[PDB]
Design a protein around this ligand. Structure first.
Ligand code: 1LA
Ligand SMILES: *[C@@H]1O[C@H](CO[C@H]2O[C@@H](C)[C@@H](O)[C@@H](O)[C@@H]2O)[C@@H](O[C@@H]2O[C@H](CO)[C@@H](O)[C@H](O)[C@H]2NC(C)=O)[C@H](O)[C@H]1NC(C)=O
Ligand SMILES: *[C@@H]1O[C@H](CO)[C@@H](O[C@@H]2O[C@H](CO)[C@@H](O)[C@H](O)[C@H]2NC(C)=O)[C@H](O)[C@H]1NC(C)=O
Ligand code: NAG
Lengths: 239, 268, 98, 202
């Protein structure tokens, strides 16, 4: 019994309209919206007992709910504010006690979009010394120069995602801590067997999904519009 | 004498926020408890209202109701939300729960629920079900209440075991009060011509009152309803239609268990 | 809705000068919200006790009001009831004979 | 807040057992449920306890609930690295959809991984698109070593991070350092207590 949320990540400006969506195909009458803030449990915003009905929860202010159908519950933020930066969870259920939770949606609401910037992505190839010393090969990926810190980095080998042998910095580091709006940088590692790297038919790709502006946000500067985009780097295995 | 124990609950919901729940409890026609909205605890209205329950058993039982009352209030409110705009405030729920005690150790328990003054729902067997005549929209509420296995199992315990046990205890403890005999007093009066026999102060409820010429039971006697007195006794009047002038000769005979075969006779 | 039935009657047989208790029995009404007053010569009597409200097997509500009174030749006694089911408030008078 | 968890956070070595408390004042308490949450992820249910006095288990997880005490615990046996997560206690006030859920703020667990065969080295890795730029990778140290940040703000050093080659059953720690604005790999980790037997290849 599965539940989905879109978008999964959103960077937004103050005064903007944000719409958070939830879709559920289980014919559950009941849907619920929560936000999670570190140092609190999940808190109930709005909820719904069926199509056309929405109900206030414990913290409803600033949010409006909409239930057009049995499958869609949607959290509407009419005039967004920084205080609404959070992680939002949608849930559904039938008459019973279990609520089945969605995967979450990260919201960051900024005062200003002037600093938004996509990352550069570099891929660093395994050291010959490492290969000979350990019989293992570590690729390193480097994402730099980005703002804000909303990036999902992921590793692909021959067009399929790999999680084994991967590790990514728990949070990015500031490139310029003496500044308030410093751009960020983030690194990740993928370690494979040397003989896996040595194979020239294995295609390695580090991919960063950056979350920034929408086609609908206005852009007043000269550098390209820092839209939500994918930036990536790649290499082939070599002997 | 078959004794019926009754828990009568009445709950009003004026709008989305305002609500009160009051309860009275009866054993036959004697009040044994009152539990008003204002009060955190259930009041005894008789010395023996605790029955044969220990203090610990009573505290644990009251605590269960204390939770029930708060829970009930919210659940009605969430149900109103679930049904809207089909159903809306003001709303009146009444519950009538208890058991009827029979000879031997036989009994029968009930839990009936009324919505806007119409009986619609009951607990029966293992679950809630709607009774014949009930609107179909109640099927959602019923399905939802039947999901709660915890509540189901508890209500089954209350109806199958706690009630009969407790009432047996009440009948022992309160025997003196239950078996009391209070003698009626009578008096006469007329009105435009109609004659009236007033009988008041009697316990228990069964009474015989007839208008009589000498010893010919006047067929015309019309009994009123049984009206209560504050001190837990009854009042009742019998009216006789007559042609003015023919009053002399008529008398009022009143039979009641308290009189010990010494009927009250009252000539006009 | 049910429109209230009101019935006024005395606890003991009525004797001028002799203190007594007078009952107002209000029945057959739905919904339960009600204002019940007991009047001496049109004026509200102050020490009026109320039974807890309750209802019959037919789900209709009932309640007993009573107060200490002393019937005299001159004084009139009544029970006045306000309830949504009624445009006007209903007053029933105590008649010692009825 | 009617649901309190303890400890706030705790740090534990792989293989050790740990115990998490939940205490509540919720009324009534139909059921209690334990969730696991990896940083950046949803809530996965571990178990739900429903009886007045209840015990349950799910693999290396077990739990008790005592409703009279309004108290529950979660026992994790033989902690693995993947146990690193926030653990969330949730109490439901109804046996049906009419209920509200009352969430704890969570207990943060960190499991320190067991490095079987340390081999601290520092390697140089070249950029694929250009052989001029490069990173400096410090790897294969044990969990006793701390990676202290750089003295120069020209230089960037990430904090240690542990990867698991599941198929090989192999865990390893690593840190990455760089800086474009003369910089080299012997210089990179000078400000850290790197082990004595560290490999620095030609
Ligand atoms: C009943 C006979 C009386 C017995 C003799 C005693 C005489 C004492 C005299 C005092 C009289 C007091 C006034 C009487 C009022 C009449 C009340 C009739 C009682 C029957 C209901 C008892 C329900 C108890 C279970 C409960 O608390 N359930 C709660 C709360 O339940 C929660 O807590 C529950 C109880 O907690 C415990 O279990 N505690 C416990 C403690 C220790 N060991 C085990 C358990 C349980 O956990 C459950 O799973 C959970 O959900 C739940 O929220 C329910 O939904 C409440 C409503 C139930 C009424 C339904 C009526 C149907 C209306 C339809 C409306 C139509 C819609 C219109 C839009
Ligand atoms: C409690 O008793 C019922 C028997 O039915 C009773 O239902 C009460 C609500 C009350 O009105 C009482 O006077 C009435 O007689 C048991 O229900 C039976 O359970 C079995 C198996 O569980 C079912 O197969 C039967 O259909 C069902 N009977 C009826 C008539 O519906 C109930 O199990 C019992 N529970 C406990 C906990 O003792
Ligand atoms: C009937 O009783 C309930 C519960 O005691 C009252 O609800 C409470 O109202 C107080 C103020 O009087 C609030 O502070 C509480 O939050 C409420 N408590 C609960 C548990 O609901 C209710 O107001 C009373 N109704 C009337 C008409 O007096
Ligand atoms: C609800 O109804 C009551 C009683 O009729 C009234 O006094 C009160 O103002 C109402 N409350 C709200 C919030 O509408």
């Amino acid at each position: 019994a599965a539940v989905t949320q879109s978008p999964r990540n959103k960077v937004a400006v103050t005064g903007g309209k944000v719409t958070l969506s939830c879709n559920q195909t289980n014919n559950h009458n009941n849907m619920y919206w929560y936000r999670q803030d570190t140092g609190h449990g999940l808190r109930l915003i709005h909820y719904s007992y069926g199509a056309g009905s929405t109900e206030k929860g414990d913290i409803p202010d600033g949010y409006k709910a909409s239930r057009p159908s049995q499958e869609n519950f949607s959290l509407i933020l009419e005039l967004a504010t920084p205080s609404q930066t959070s992680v939002y969870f949608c849930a559904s259920g039938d008459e019973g006690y279990t609520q089945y939770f969605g995967p979450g949606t990260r919201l960051l609401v900024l005062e200003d979009l002037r600093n938004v910037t996509p990352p550069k992505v570099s891929l660093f190839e395994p050291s010959k010394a490492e290969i000979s010393h350990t019989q293992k090969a570590t690729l390193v990926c480097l994402a730099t120069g980005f703002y804000p810190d909303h990036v999902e980095l992921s590793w692909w080998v021959n067009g399929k995602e790999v999680h084994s042998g991967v590790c990514t910095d728990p949070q990015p580091l500031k490139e310029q801590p003496a500044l308030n709006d410093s751009r960020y940088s983030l690194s990740s590692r993928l370690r494979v067997s040397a003989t896996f790297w040595q194979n020239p038919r294995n295609h390695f790709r580090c991919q960063v999904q950056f979350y920034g502006l929408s086609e609908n946000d206005e852009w007043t500067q000269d550098r390209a519009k820092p839209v939500t985009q994918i930036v990536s780097a790649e290499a082939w295995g070599r002997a | 004498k078959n004794y019926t124990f009754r828990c009568l609950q009445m709950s009003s919901f004026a709008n989305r926020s305002w609500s009160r729940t009051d309860s009275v409890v009866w054993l036959g026609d004697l009040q044994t408890h009152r539990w008003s909205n204002d009060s955190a605890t259930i009041s005894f209205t008789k010395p023996w209202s605790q029955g044969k329950l220990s203090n610990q058993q009573w505290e644990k039982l009251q605590h269960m109701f204390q939770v029930y009352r708060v829970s009930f209030t919210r659940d009605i409110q969430e149900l109103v939300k679930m049904m809207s705009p089909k159903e809306d405030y003001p709303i009146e729920i009444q519950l009538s729960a208890g058991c009827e005690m029979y000879p031997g150790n036989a009994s029968e328990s009930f839990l009936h629920v009324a919505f806007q003054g119409k009986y619609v729902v009951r607990f029966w067997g293992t679950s809630w079900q709607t009774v014949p005549g009930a609107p179909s929209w109640l099927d959602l509420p019923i399905k939802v209440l039947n999901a709660d296995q915890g509540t189901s199992a508890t209500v089954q315990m209350l109806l199958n075991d706690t009630c009969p046990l407790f009432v047996r205890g009440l009948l022992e403890a309160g025997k003196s009060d239950l078996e009391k005999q209070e003698k009626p007093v009578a008096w006469l009066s007329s009105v435009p011509r109609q004659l009236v026999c007033h009988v008041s102060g009697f316990y228990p409820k069964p009474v015989w009152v007839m208008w009589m010429r000498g010893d010919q039971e006047q067929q015309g006697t019309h009994r009123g309803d049984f009206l209560p007195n504050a001190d837990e006794t009854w009042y009742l009047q019998a009216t006789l239609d007559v042609e003015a002038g023919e009053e002399a000769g008529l008398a009022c005979r009143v039979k009641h268990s308290s009189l010990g075969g010494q009927d009250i006779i009252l000539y006009w | 809705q049910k429109t209230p039935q009101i019935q006024v009657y005395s606890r003991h047989p009525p004797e001028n000068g002799k203190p007594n208790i007078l009952n107002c029995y209000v029945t057959q009404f739905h919904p339960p919200h009600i204002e019940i007053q007991m009047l001496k010569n049109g004026k509200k009597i102050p020490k009026v006790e109320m039974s807890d409200m309750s209802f019959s097997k037919d789900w209709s509500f009932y309640i007993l009001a009573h107060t200490e009174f002393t019937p005299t030749e001159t004084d009139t006694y009544a029970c006045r009831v306000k309830h949504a089911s009624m445009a006007e408030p209903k007053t029933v008078y105590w008649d010692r004979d009825m | 807040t009617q649901v309190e968890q303890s400890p706030q956070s705790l740090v534990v070595r792989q293989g050790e057992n740990c115990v998490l408390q939940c205490n509540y004042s919720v009324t009534p308490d139909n059921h209690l449920r334990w969730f696991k949450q990896d940083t950046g992820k949803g809530l996965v249910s571990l178990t739900v306890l429903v009886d007045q006095k209840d015990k349950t288990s799910n693999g290396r997880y077990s739990a008790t609930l005592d409703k009279d005490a309004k108290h529950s615990t979660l026992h994790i046996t033989a902690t693995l690295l993947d146990d690193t997560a926030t653990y969330i206690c949730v109490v439901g006030d109804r046996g049906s959809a009419l209920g509200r859920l009352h969430f704890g703020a969570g207990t943060q667990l960190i499991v320190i991984p067991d490095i079987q065969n340390p081999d601290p080295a520092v390697y140089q890795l070249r950029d694929s698109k250009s052989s001029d730029k490069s990173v400096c990778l410090f790897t294969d140290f044990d969990s006793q070593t701390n990676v202290s940040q750089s003295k120069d703000s020209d230089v960037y050093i990430t904090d240690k991070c542990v990867l698991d080659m599941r198929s090989m059953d192999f865990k390893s720690n690593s840190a990455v350092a760089w800086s474009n604005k003369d910089f080299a790999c012997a210089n990179a980790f000078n400000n850290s207590i790197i082990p004595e037997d560290t490999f620095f290849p030609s």
